[PDB]
Write a protein that holds these residues in place. Structure first.
Motif, PDB file in Angstrom:
ATOM      1  N   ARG A   1       0.996  -1.157  -0.047  1.00 53.45           N
ATOM      2  CA  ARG A   1      -0.060  -0.040   0.083  1.00 53.45           C
ATOM      3  C   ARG A   1       0.811   1.180  -0.104  1.00 53.45           C
ATOM      4  N   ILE A   2       1.853   1.386   0.679  1.00 55.14           N
ATOM      5  CA  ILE A   2       2.871   2.136   0.925  1.00 55.14           C
ATOM      6  C   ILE A   2       3.552   2.614  -0.319  1.00 55.14           C
ATOM      7  N   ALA A   3       3.728   1.496  -0.946  1.00 57.07           N
ATOM      8  CA  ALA A   3       4.578   1.680  -2.186  1.00 57.07           C
ATOM      9  C   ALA A   3       3.678   2.481  -3.541  1.00 57.07           C
ATOM     10  N   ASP A   4       2.380   2.229  -3.192  1.00 51.74           N
ATOM     11  CA  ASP A   4       1.509   2.854  -4.186  1.00 51.74           C
ATOM     12  C   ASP A   4       1.357   4.276  -3.749  1.00 51.74           C
ATOM     13  N   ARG A   5       1.012   4.488  -2.507  1.00 51.10           N
ATOM     14  CA  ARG A   5       0.866   5.711  -1.899  1.00 51.10           C
ATOM     15  C   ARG A   5       2.176   6.606  -1.616  1.00 51.10           C
ATOM     16  N   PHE A   6       3.030   6.281  -1.492  1.00 53.86           N
ATOM     17  CA  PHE A   6       4.429   7.007  -1.228  1.00 53.86           C
ATOM     18  C   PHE A   6       5.436   6.570  -2.264  1.00 53.86           C
ATOM     19  N   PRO A   7       5.417   6.776  -3.557  1.00 55.90           N
ATOM     20  CA  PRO A   7       6.408   6.007  -4.372  1.00 55.90           C
ATOM     21  C   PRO A   7       7.855   6.656  -4.343  1.00 55.90           C
ATOM     22  N   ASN A   8       8.063   7.883  -3.777  1.00 53.08           N
ATOM     23  CA  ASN A   8       9.374   8.634  -3.686  1.00 53.08           C
ATOM     24  C   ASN A   8       9.905   8.448  -2.309  1.00 53.08           C
ATOM     25  N   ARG A   9       9.507   7.380  -1.383  1.00 57.65           N
ATOM     26  CA  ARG A   9       9.791   7.497  -0.154  1.00 57.65           C
ATOM     27  C   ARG A   9      10.051   5.931   0.101  1.00 57.65           C
ATOM     28  N   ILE A  10      11.294   5.804   0.971  1.00 61.04           N
ATOM     29  CA  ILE A  10      11.638   4.567   1.276  1.00 61.04           C
ATOM     30  C   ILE A  10      11.052   4.092   2.691  1.00 61.04           C
ATOM     31  N   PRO A  11      10.305   3.079   2.748  1.00 60.54           N
ATOM     32  CA  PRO A  11       9.628   2.714   4.079  1.00 60.54           C
ATOM     33  C   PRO A  11      10.573   1.939   4.669  1.00 60.54           C
ATOM     34  N   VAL A  12      11.154   2.583   6.014  1.00 61.42           N
ATOM     35  CA  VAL A  12      12.216   1.874   6.975  1.00 61.42           C
ATOM     36  C   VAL A  12      11.375   1.803   8.376  1.00 61.42           C
ATOM     37  N   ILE A  13      11.580   0.258   8.769  1.00 62.13           N
ATOM     38  CA  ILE A  13      10.959   0.241  10.034  1.00 62.13           C
ATOM     39  C   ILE A  13      12.188   0.270  11.016  1.00 62.13           C
ATOM     40  N   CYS A  14      12.374   1.129  11.784  1.00 65.40           N
ATOM     41  CA  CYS A  14      13.667   1.608  12.680  1.00 65.40           C
ATOM     42  C   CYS A  14      13.395   1.353  14.143  1.00 65.40           C
ATOM     43  N   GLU A  15      13.805   0.372  14.841  1.00 71.52           N
ATOM     44  CA  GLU A  15      13.703  -0.023  16.129  1.00 71.52           C
ATOM     45  C   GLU A  15      15.024   0.050  16.879  1.00 71.52           C
ATOM     46  N   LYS A  16      14.996   0.045  18.219  1.00 71.79           N
ATOM     47  CA  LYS A  16      16.155   0.424  18.959  1.00 71.79           C
ATOM     48  C   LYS A  16      16.765  -1.224  19.420  1.00 71.79           C
ATOM     49  N   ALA A  17      18.130  -1.351  19.561  1.00 69.57           N
ATOM     50  CA  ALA A  17      18.655  -2.623  19.752  1.00 69.57           C
ATOM     51  C   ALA A  17      18.257  -2.763  21.253  1.00 69.57           C
ATOM     52  N   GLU A  18      18.349  -4.068  21.335  1.00 62.74           N
ATOM     53  CA  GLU A  18      17.526  -4.529  22.756  1.00 62.74           C
ATOM     54  C   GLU A  18      18.434  -4.275  24.097  1.00 62.74           C
ATOM     55  N   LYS A  19      19.716  -4.424  23.935  1.00 66.78           N
ATOM     56  CA  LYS A  19      20.809  -4.034  24.905  1.00 66.78           C
ATOM     57  C   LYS A  19      21.219  -3.103  25.317  1.00 66.78           C
TER      58      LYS A  19
ATOM     59  N   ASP B   1      21.261   1.177  26.090  1.00 67.60           N
ATOM     60  CA  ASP B   1      20.602   2.134  26.975  1.00 67.60           C
ATOM     61  C   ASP B   1      20.156   3.378  26.329  1.00 67.60           C
ATOM     62  N   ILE B   2      20.297   3.509  25.036  1.00 70.10           N
ATOM     63  CA  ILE B   2      20.021   4.793  24.382  1.00 70.10           C
ATOM     64  C   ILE B   2      18.449   4.931  24.350  1.00 70.10           C
ATOM     65  N   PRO B   3      17.884   6.281  24.281  1.00 73.18           N
ATOM     66  CA  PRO B   3      16.448   6.415  24.384  1.00 73.18           C
ATOM     67  C   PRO B   3      15.479   5.579  23.448  1.00 73.18           C
ATOM     68  N   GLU B   4      14.594   5.132  23.737  1.00 73.43           N
ATOM     69  CA  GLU B   4      13.524   4.707  22.826  1.00 73.43           C
ATOM     70  C   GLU B   4      12.435   5.859  22.321  1.00 73.43           C
ATOM     71  N   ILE B   5      11.655   5.537  21.289  1.00 69.94           N
ATOM     72  CA  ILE B   5      10.629   6.571  20.916  1.00 69.94           C
ATOM     73  C   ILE B   5       9.672   5.490  20.234  1.00 69.94           C
ATOM     74  N   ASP B   6       8.331   6.284  20.371  1.00 70.32           N
ATOM     75  CA  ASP B   6       7.087   5.593  19.972  1.00 70.32           C
ATOM     76  C   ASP B   6       6.941   5.463  18.313  1.00 70.32           C
ATOM     77  N   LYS B   7       7.792   6.269  17.502  1.00 70.91           N
ATOM     78  CA  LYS B   7       7.958   6.256  15.951  1.00 70.91           C
ATOM     79  C   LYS B   7       8.875   5.209  15.620  1.00 70.91           C
ATOM     80  N   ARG B   8       8.456   3.895  14.996  1.00 75.44           N
ATOM     81  CA  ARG B   8       9.301   3.307  14.281  1.00 75.44           C
ATOM     82  C   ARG B   8       8.950   3.176  12.836  1.00 75.44           C
TER      83      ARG B   8
END
Lengths: 137, 136, 138, 139, 138, 137, 138
Positions: free
Chosen positions: G44-62, G64-71
């Motif tokens: 769906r994103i590939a059709d709706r946002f053709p010039n955008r790269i869809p990245v799922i970005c998450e914190k490494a588990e171990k 202690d850098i801050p988390e955030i609710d956007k991934r």
């Protein structure tokens, strides 16, 4: 014959008193000692209940008539005035003349009862002594 | 010879003497006020705890008289007791009624003579009491 | 002639009986006067004597305590029960060794109750305060 | 004659208290066993719903006037101050004299409701006992 | 005889407050010096570890009823609303009339825990001061 | 004569809520218009620059305790978890009960910085609105 | 009811503990959503946002850098790796003095690489580019 009755004592319309008729009246108390008087009063009181035994004598200086009676057996319910009338009838003093009686130098009231006068004033010998007179002392 | 006692006076009704003149006047009328106040003062000084009563008969009453009108009454006596004193003095038989009056009123039997005196004593210091055989 | 002397001849007596035939009758105050007269009276007296409680004070019938001929008492409103009681005592000449009791509505009012308060609660329908006195509490 | 009214007591130099008028004062509680008292207070609760049944007696040592009424049927919505005025009227205490009342040896505030004072201070027998005095007899 | 119960106060024309009935109680804080108050609160904390010690007094300008209790040992788990009902029942305020309470001149929410209100609003002396009133003034 | 402390409330069988204690239970936004709120948050931004201004209110369907503080001046370096503990302590929720907070209806991770949460989610009026609850919506 | 005042009463305190019972599920994006849903979303994103790269970005588990609710990150195709890293740094507010690292399949991508090229090489079967960020280089 027999003597007839005549109304001849007309007198000189003053009748003089006899100049030498010596009758020596004494007081009742002076004629009898106390013990005799007390025995007599006790005897009379016993014999005559409801009677007051009065010794009634004339005042020395009074010309009110005398009488030979001085012992009066007065019913207890008689008033002074009634007893005074008894004396008046006994000595026959006419009503126009006053009469006075004295129990120990005092005039008892007319409506007092002889029993009450007796209760207050009786002699130590049991009698009530009353003086009568034609004049107040 | 001595005189005998005779029961000869009991003889109907007994008439009164027509001329036996006793004063028969009221105490107040015989003595001026000043003399009366002097007397009551002296009696109060002479007989403490005594009520000095001048007791006289009502004129219109046929109740017996007596020669005593000065009565020295113990202060604790009741009216009824004083009335009996009067009765026995004049020898009125009990079947006959007797009345006394202070200021024209019949004082109560159970009142103390001292209280009657405190309320009703005369200006001269005496307590004046009238006795009678009737109450009109 | 001679004046009667004073004699202390009654105190020495062995006895002092009451007279057997002195026919005086003491009536109840209420029995002598109709209601409307008594109510008119209490009103009249109240108006004439402000700050006064008009008390009708009579002896209990069965008590041998001394009586007296005064029964109308014009009592200061500020007097206590006890003070009024002493007034009664002095009036009837009851010696202090003798107890005295009074009743309003057949109840014994406490000393230090004010006569004004006793009146406020217990005055008669006719406007008087009725007080009974006795030498024996009943 | 008839007896006349005389104002003969007002002029007295003094007015002594009677030396022998023996009044037998007893506390209400001492006069009745617990059974009678609880029965009475219950009867009153049933018969007089919006009423607080008060036994009001004088503090012994106090010089304040007495009165023979000690049972007061106080409407429940009344404040302490209003009830106190009722007492004053009943004993006729002049206003210049302070009056004090005590429930469980304490002075209730003038604006408390008698129903609340009853709720917290009522006796086991159902009555509210209040003693009145001309002084604070618990200080 | 025996005194009868009379419903004689209810019929009165009016019911005035007594003109000379004394107030022996000012504000709790003003009647006792600080040291005594803090000693008292400390004593209560020792004796009553799971209790919030509340000094609860009536707002000055409010005609809401008073009561003689000002010391309240409130369970820490009680909500504001539950404590408010406790006060209402103590003073007998009818439910049709509103009740308000104030800590530092603010109306606490009905669902705050008394322990939390205490935690933030306790006085320097260890007590929690609560003002009650029949209207919202502050 | 002094009033004594009595443990007379805990004894009770029950504890009802007051039936007529009328306190406004309304949201911050409904009580103040947008202009007043933005003026306030701007004054706060000047007066407390290193502080994140949070309006923290209870989810209405939740029976979790309320508290009268809803304005929180949060240090920029605090994490979500630390801020949550601040709320818990202020309302005195016992640790055995779970607590949740929501920003734009989402549970922020316990290790996000409040500054980042503010950066993403601040209201147009300058505040960060946080809902707290005892349940997860 | 006066307006609540702002008080700077948090920063003062000596310690700042984490809540002991704030239970948020920590879960990876892949574990929460099945492949079908993920592939569907990326298409769906590939059709709706053709010039955008869809990245799922998450914190490494171990880490202690801050988390955030956007991934979910919609990355412009011309962005370099480094520019995207700065975007992450600013979303989570990591101060510049602290190092940040990102990983695609446990390897550190070069700064001057274009995100489009990294996507071409490393995109998931589900169409997303998975990036983990951390404060250490593993």
């Amino acid at each position: 014959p027999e003597e007839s009755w005549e109304d001849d004592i007309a007198g000189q319309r003053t009748f003089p008193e006899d100049p030498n008729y010596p009758v020596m009246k004494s007081t009742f108390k002076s004629e009898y000692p106390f013990e005799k008087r007390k025995a007599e009063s006790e005897r009379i009181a016993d014999r005559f209940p409801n009677r007051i035994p009065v010794i009634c004598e004339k005042a020395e200086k009074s010309d009110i008539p005398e009488i030979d009676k001085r012992k009066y057996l007065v019913p207890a319910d008689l008033t002074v005035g009634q007893f005074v009338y008894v004396i008046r009838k006994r000595i026959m003093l006419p009503p126009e003349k006053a009469i006075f009686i004295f129990v120990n130098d005092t005039l008892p009231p007319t409506a007092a009862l002889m029993s009450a006068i007796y209760q207050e004033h009786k002699d130590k010998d049991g009698f009530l002594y009353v003086t009568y007179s034609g004049e107040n002392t």
